[PDB]
Amino acid sequence: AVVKCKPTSPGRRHVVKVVNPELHKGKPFAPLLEKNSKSGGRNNNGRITTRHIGGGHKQAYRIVDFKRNKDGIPAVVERLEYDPNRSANIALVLYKDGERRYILAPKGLKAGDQIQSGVDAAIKPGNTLPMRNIPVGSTVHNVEMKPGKGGQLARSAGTYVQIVARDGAYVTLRLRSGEMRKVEADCRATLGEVGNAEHMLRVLGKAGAARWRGVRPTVRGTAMNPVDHPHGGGEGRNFGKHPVTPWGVQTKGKKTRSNKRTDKFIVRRRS
Amino acid sequence: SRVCQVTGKRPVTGNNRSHALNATKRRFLPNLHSHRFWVESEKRFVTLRVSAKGMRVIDKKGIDTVLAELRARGEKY
Amino acid sequence: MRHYEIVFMVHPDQSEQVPGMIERYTAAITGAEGKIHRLEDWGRRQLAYPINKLHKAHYVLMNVEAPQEVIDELETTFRFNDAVIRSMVMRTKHAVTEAS
Amino acid sequence: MQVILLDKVANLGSLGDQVNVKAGYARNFLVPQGKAVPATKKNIEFFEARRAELEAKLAEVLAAANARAEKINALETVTIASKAGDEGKLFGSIGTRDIADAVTAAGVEVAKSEVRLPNGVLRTTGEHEVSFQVHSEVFAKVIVNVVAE
RNA sequence: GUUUAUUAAAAACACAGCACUGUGCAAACACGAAAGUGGACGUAUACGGUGUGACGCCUGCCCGGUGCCGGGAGGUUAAU
Numbered sequence: 001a002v003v004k005c006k007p008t009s010p011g012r013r014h015v016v017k018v019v020n021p022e023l024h025k026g027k028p029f030a031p032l033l034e035k036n037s038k039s040g041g042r043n044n045n046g047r048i049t050t051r052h053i054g055g056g057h058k059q060a061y062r063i064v065d066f067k068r069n070k071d072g073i074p075a076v077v078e079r080l081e082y083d084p085n086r087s088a089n090i091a092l093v094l095y096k097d098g099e100r101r102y103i104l105a106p107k108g109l110k111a112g113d114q115i116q117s118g119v120d121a122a123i124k125p126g127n128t129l130p131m132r133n134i135p136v137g138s139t140v141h142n143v144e145m146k147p148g149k150g151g152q153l154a155r156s157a158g159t160y161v162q163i164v165a166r167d168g169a170y171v172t173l174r175l176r177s178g179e180m181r182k183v184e185a186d187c188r189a190t191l192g193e194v195g196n197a198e199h200m201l202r203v204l205g206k207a208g209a210a211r212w213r214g215v216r217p218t219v220r221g222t223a224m225n226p227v228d229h230p231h232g233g234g235e236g237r238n239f240g241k242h243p244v245t246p247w248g249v250q251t252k253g254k255k256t257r258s259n260k261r262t263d264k265f266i267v268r269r270r271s
Numbered sequence: 272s273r274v275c276q277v278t279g280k281r282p283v284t285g286n287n288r289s290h291a292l293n294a295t296k297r298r299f300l301p302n303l304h305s306h307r308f309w310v311e312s313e314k315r316f317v318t319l320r321v322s323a324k325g326m327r328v329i330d331k332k333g334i335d336t337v338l339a340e341l342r343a344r345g346e347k348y
Numbered sequence: 349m350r351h352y353e354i355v356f357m358v359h360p361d362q363s364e365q366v367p368g369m370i371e372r373y374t375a376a377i378t379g380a381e382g383k384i385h386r387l388e389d390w391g392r393r394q395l396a397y398p399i400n401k402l403h404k405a406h407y408v409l410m411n412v413e414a415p416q417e418v419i420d421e422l423e424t425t426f427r428f429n430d431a432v433i434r435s436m437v438m439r440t441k442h443a444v445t446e447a448s
Numbered sequence: 449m450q451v452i453l454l455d456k457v458a459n460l461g462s463l464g465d466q467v468n469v470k471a472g473y474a475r476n477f478l479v480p481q482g483k484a485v486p487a488t489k490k491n492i493e494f495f496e497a498r499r500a501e502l503e504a505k506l507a508e509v510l511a512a513a514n515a516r517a518e519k520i521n522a523l524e525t526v527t528i529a530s531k532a533g534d535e536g537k538l539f540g541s542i543g544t545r546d547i548a549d550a551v552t553a554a555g556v557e558v559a560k561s562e563v564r565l566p567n568g569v570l571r572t573t574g575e576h577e578v579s580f581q582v583h584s585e586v587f588a589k590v591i592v593n594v595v596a597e
Numbered sequence: 598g599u600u601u602a603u604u605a606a607a608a609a610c611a612c613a614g615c616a617c618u619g620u621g622c623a624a625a626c627a628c629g630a631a632a633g634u635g636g637a638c639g640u641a642u643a644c645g646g647u648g649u650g651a652c653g654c655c656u657g658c659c660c661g662g663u664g665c666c667g668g669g670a671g672g673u674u675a676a677u
Contacts, residue, residue: 013652014652015613036638039634039635039636039637041627041635041636042628042634042635043627043628043633043634043635044633044635045628045629045634045635047627047635048627049626049628049634049635050626050627050637051627051645052645053636061638085637085639087639087642087643088642119539123424145621145622153621153622153641154640154641155639155640156639156642156643157642157643158642159640159643169568175641177620177621177641179621179641181621183621194642196642198642200642201642203613203614205613205614206613207611207612207613209613210613217610218646219611220610220647220648220649221646221647221648222648223609223611239648243647243648243665244646245626245645245646249646250664250665251617251618251645251647252648252665253619253665253666254665254666256626257619257620257621257625259623259624262622265621270619270620272631330471331488362535362536365536430537431535431536
């Protein structure tokens, strides 16, 4: 559940821990782990590109099966594991033929539930099927952008996409932010909402939960120098300017969405 | 690099002269495009990154003459 | 087991496929160990208001004694199907007979 | 363009015209498909005696051979008996591959690229009309009978 | 906790929390003439930027100027 900690020391007062008692306490399945080397926000040139990340505890990459290429095969969910690179939990699933795979764990999933995949999959949550046998109006997740891609949409904790319209070979979806967009009907999706919906309720308590996760402290623009930031300067807390990025681009309202290739797919913008 | 295969065009340098005649060095780039040509002498596809003036030259000449010039200059086709 | 009075409407070109659905539903009834009471197909007739257009839908009454797990599965096969539009299940009230 | 034409183009081609067209239509459609040859002072001499006198009638009898290839299958019907769902809702949508294989195994030996589907990927189980592009003018009227199993 | 190594350890910086803004993935943004990377083998309960800085009570008015967004009726408008 969501347990608020007692203020035994300065720092544990605001710690609110999301403790899932159904998670497996043990080592994960070893042939599905590979290395995940840290970068710290640096490209091949060695200069920093995505700032204010770095440090923290190590992690290994779990190979989560996205495509669900097996069709017409029953699947028994073995156990639930905590993936450190995600916001929701993952599920180790033992298939019928003996192959163990990591999948995304939905909301209504416990140890012992049976799922499947293919076009003959049912409407029970946890099944992966293309968008031509799904009834229009239900809740799906793990939505592919292109047929055979693997899945791009609705994979964080609690994120779900509701099917709105079905125009021939097109499926018009309402996304989580509220942007109506058309995708291919041949793309696959997994039914139900993504589990661990209480993950937003963790408020992390202290600076250390930001530090060992990989979130570096952010320096404000007023505290910086005029050579370091377009803001700053002055003899005591002077702002006097418009809010911009450190590279001269205006922020707090600026539409930078400009690719002109996927504007046909977008129906209604975010409001 | 940005070298045309047929005509041999390469980017040069010039001045960006404004209304106040401010000399600012910039680069003139050719209109290069990677087009896939059907060759009847070879009966196949040849991908060439050529200029559009070179495309007009190939529209004038035969494609076998252009491939013969590329063979004479030692270019890969 | 409880008496469940099922009424459902079917679209016409899929109402041509109604007797196979009746055979599947009575196979589920035979799996429920209950006896069927009303095999009266009411038939294709005129609707009173536009319900997902191309009017004159197909009425079917079932009225079978069944347990709760079988009627939950048979309701999920109703709600998850494009053929069954407006099914409903009613009370027992000592299930009934001719002159509908 | 001075490009001389070879095929019977349904808009401007009448077997030997010198109609001015754009370079993008000639370089990308006419040349790679063998529809036309760019004529600059030697291909005119090639078309003058060697092509228009003999090879035009060869193209005409190859069009007649394509008409005979259409006339191979006198039945003009395909009964697909693939696995289907419960009371409609077919298991897999049949594209041009299985239709081309079923026509090639018994009937017309035309390739997959000439097969056209007017009614989509044919999700509805029943009678369907499928036309073939064996010729630019004469079309096929194949009656495909999708049968549920 | 950190800071002006070598005159300033602080009310300065930073901090979990809160709000605004942008972004539907070949995302925004950044390094890089470009390829290619970071972001991220993450994807709207996520990421980036900005402002403030636990917690309780809260955050009232104004679109005149400037900044941002939308609409193109009308005027003006270079290159061809």
